[PDB]
Amino acid sequence: MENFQKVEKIGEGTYGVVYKARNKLTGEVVALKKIVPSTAIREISLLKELNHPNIVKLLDVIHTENKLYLVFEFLHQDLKKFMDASALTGIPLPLIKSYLFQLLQGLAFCHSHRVLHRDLKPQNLLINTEGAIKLADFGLARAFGVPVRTYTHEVVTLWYRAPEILLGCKYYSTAVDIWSLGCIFAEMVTRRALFPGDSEIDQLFRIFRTLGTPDEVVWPGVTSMPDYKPSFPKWARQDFSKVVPPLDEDGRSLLSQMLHYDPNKRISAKAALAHPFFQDVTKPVPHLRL
Numbered sequence: 554m555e556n557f558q559k560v561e562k563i564g565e566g567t568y569g570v571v572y573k574a575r576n577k578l579t580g581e582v583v584a585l586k587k588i589v590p591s592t593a594i595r596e597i598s599l600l601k602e603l604n605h606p607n608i609v610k611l612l613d614v615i616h617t618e619n620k621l622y623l624v625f626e627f628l629h630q631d632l633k634k635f636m637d638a639s640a641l642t643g644i645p646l647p648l649i650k651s652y653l654f655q656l657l658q659g660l661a662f663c664h665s666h667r668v669l670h671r672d673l674k675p676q677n678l679l680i681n682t683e684g685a686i687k688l689a690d691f692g693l694a695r696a697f698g699v700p701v702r703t704y705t706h707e708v709v710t711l712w713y714r715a716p717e718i719l720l721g722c723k724y725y726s727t728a729v730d731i732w733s734l735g736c737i738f739a740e741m742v743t744r745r746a747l748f749p750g751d752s753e754i755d756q757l758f759r760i761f762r763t764l765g766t767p768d769e770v771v772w773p774g775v776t777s778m779p780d781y782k783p784s785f786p787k788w789a790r791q792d793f794s795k796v797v798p799p800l801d802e803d804g805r806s807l808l809s810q811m812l813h814y815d816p817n818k819r820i821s822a823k824a825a826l827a828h829p830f831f832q833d834v835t836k837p838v839p840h841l842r843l
């Protein structure tokens with residue numbers, strides 16, 4: 554793209570290379586994602602107007618030469634790197650709370666407009682020096698699908714996938730985002746992925762081992778889902794006090810609502826923002842090492 558100067562490769566997304574680039578005329582530093590279906594282009598174009606302080610701004614969609622480039626506002630780190638970096642001591646709780654709180658506001662805005670993310674994970678949550686956190690790649694899964702592998706063959710993580718997706722639900726809802734963020738919330742607290750599955754069945758059985766194998770009691774309709782098997786093992790549900798120590802009762806309360814099996818009972822982003830866990834929410838500045 555003649556209007557951009559590629560500064561460095563920052564990464565490899567599910568769809569293609571991600572470049573840090575500068576706009577040869579505006580002087581703007583952006584993130585440039587290289588990714589043609591008529592449908593995809595209309596979908597992405599609606600994303601241009603879905604603007605919120607906690608959603609990485611899509612600056613521009615450039616379709617040229619059967620090539621597709623998305624131009625995003627640039628943020629200097631993602632949450633996965635920040636968590637790696639905060640391994641020894643953990644992300645402090647007030648900062649975990651502010652991030653979750655901001656992320657929920659993000660989801661509440663998108664969701665109210667009926668946009669799902671569908672592939673939330675720490676690599677697409679981006680952070681700046683001001684204490685902000687923002688969701689990247691919102692709405693791209695609807696436009697482009699979610700591949701078992703990326704363009705580089707790197708395996709798409711299953712770790713944050715809602716169970717109604719793993720059980721083959723075709724028509725899942727906004728609740729699938731709530732589930733992922735719940736998994737991400739647990740991970741920040743404990744410094745270990747909640748459910749790090751390495752196949753769909755491992756992913757599901759890991760969920761079952763912690764949350765209880767789901768039945769008709771906790772999840773009406775579950776036994777009628779496409780990939781449900783009466784032969785699944787029947788595991789007992791563990792207490793959250795064991796799962797996310799040393800998270801407090803309000804935290805554990807909210808986490809459990811975000812991880813309800815039935816997507817209809819799963820707490821919405823909007824209700825979550827009202828939960829007492831956020832009574833004392835503040836906005837700390839992290840220390841970043843740019």
Ligand SMILES: O=C(Nc1ccccc1)c1cc[nH]n1
Pocket residue numbers: 563564571583584609625626627628629630631679689
């Ligand atoms: O990927 C982006 N930025 C980034 C991520 C990790 C490390 C350094 C920079 C990005 C995507 C959209 N804006 N920024």
